[PDB]
């Protein structure tokens, strides 16, 4: 969450959290910037609900598409980049970072996927930069008429509106593996 640099949409990063206590109080509390939507779980009970290997995935996408990072929603971001599982059991935090992630010249670091042969499966990432061919003539290894590079840049700029300004989302997925419980958060601690 407090990281200085954040991953692009095509290479959405993942960080497994395991064998450890997790504090969700720092998150969730003070909810104005966030758009906490806890699909599949109790937002208040995240502290008491124990999962087997909590995962966290972080990317920067325009604020219009924070919605497409939802179970069962179809759009360029979730049919070609990050697809959430129908049985998603994790929250989807998101916030506004125009100041941290934008520059007057226009940040072009973040890139997005506009062409994949078929919709990607749940929690799946493809980082290959290979050309996409819709034409009968083969791609030939160079992007060309009817062949498209899979990564177009996100043109962030400072004066842009709330809808198109950069928003950073950390989709904290949780998995109930038949594995022994690892991420558990309760303490309470009363005096003897």
């Amino acid at each position: 969450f407090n990281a200085t640099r954040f991953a692009s949409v095509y290479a959405w990063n993942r960080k497994r959290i395991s064998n450890c206590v997790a504090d969700y109080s720092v998150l969730y509390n003070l909810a104005p910037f966030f758009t906490f939507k806890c699909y599949g779980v109790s937002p208040t009970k995240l502290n008491d609900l124990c999962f087997t290997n909590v995962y966290a995935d972080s990317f920067v996408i325009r604020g219009d598409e924070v919605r497409q990072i939802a179970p069962g929603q179809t759009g360029n971001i979730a049919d070609y980049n990050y697809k959430l599982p129908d049985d998603f059991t994790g929250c989807v935090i998101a916030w506004n970072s125009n100041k941290l992630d934008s520059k007057v010249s226009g940040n072009y670091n973040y890139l997005y996927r506009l062409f994949r042969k078929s919709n990607l499966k749940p929690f799946e990432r493809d980082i290959s930069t290979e050309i996409y061919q819709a034409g009968n003539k083969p791609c030939n290894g160079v992007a060309g008429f009817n062949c498209y590079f899979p990564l177009r840049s996100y043109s962030f700029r400072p004066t842009y509106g709330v809808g198109h300004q950069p928003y950073r989302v950390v989709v904290l997925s949780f998995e109930l593996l038949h594995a022994p419980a690892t991420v558990c958060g309760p303490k309470k601690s009363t005096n003897l």
Partner: antibody
Framework: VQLVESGGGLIQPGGSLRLSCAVS??????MSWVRQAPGKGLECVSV???????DYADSVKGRFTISRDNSKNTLYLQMNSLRAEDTALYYC?????????????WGQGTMVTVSS | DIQMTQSPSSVSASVGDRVTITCRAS??????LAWYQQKPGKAPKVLIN???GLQSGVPSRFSGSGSGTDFTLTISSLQPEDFATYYC?????????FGPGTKL
């Protein structure tokens, strides 16, 4: 987002002319020069891609070059061996977009003409 | 040039009535055709979504038809601004060829 097109001036036959269109509101990446033809519908003169690969109309092949100035965001079209048929109104347009070849935001265009 | 043709050469249309336009293709460009709208003294702008997925930025008025060599465009409500020239580009292969076109 309007594209500033200049260099649309009458030129002699067989001559070489450069058409310069400044591009604003988006980075030049995939762009083209569709030409509106007087007495006819739109026809295609030249196209460019983000990689820098360039494809040209068979009639204009070998006489036209299109390049992107990264610093100035300006398309450059050089026309050689100018002929009455080749001369026409020209526009700077995004060459292709999305799943298949979308020509979308079209500048007001420069009327390029040849006369002896 | 690809064998691109349109029918009819001219369209005569009363206000607020159904109007249909036709175009022809010979490489059997499959499901790759696009439509553009221009009025006199105007720079033409996007009409059909160029087969990218579904028509975008437009209401139910415009009709998306174009499978194999057969494509049609019809709009039931002819608003005064709507009457304009209609051109169809070729999406099958470069060099792309725009259709001869027909106006209201």
């Amino acid at each position: 987002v309007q594209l500033v097109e200049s260099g649309g001036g009458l030129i002699q036959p067989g001559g070489s002319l450069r058409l310069s269109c400044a591009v604003s509101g988006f980075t030049v990446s995939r762009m083209s020069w569709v030409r509106q033809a007087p007495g006819k519908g739109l026809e295609c003169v030249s196209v460019i891609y983000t990689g820098g690969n360039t494809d040209y109309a068979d009639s204009v092949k070998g006489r036209f070059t299109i390049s992107r100035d990264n610093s100035k965001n300006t398309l450059y079209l050089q026309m050689n061996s100018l002929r009455a048929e080749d001369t026409a109104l020209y526009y700077c347009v995004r060459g292709s977009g999305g799943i298949h070849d979308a020509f979308d935001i079209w500048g007001q265009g420069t009327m390029v003409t040849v006369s002896s | 040039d690809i064998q691109m043709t349109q029918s009819p050469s001219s369209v005569s249309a009363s206000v607020g009535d159904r109007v249909t336009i036709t175009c022809r293709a010979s490489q059997g460009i499959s499901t790759w055709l696009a439509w553009y709208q221009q009025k006199p003294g105007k720079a033409p702008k996007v009409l059909i979504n160029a087969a990218s997925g579904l028509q975008s930025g437009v209401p139910s008025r415009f009709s998306g038809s174009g499978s194999g060599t057969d494509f049609t465009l019809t709009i039931s409500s002819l608003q005064p601004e709507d009457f304009a020239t209609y051109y169809c580009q070729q999406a099958h292969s470069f060099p792309p060829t725009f259709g001869p076109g027909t106006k209201l």
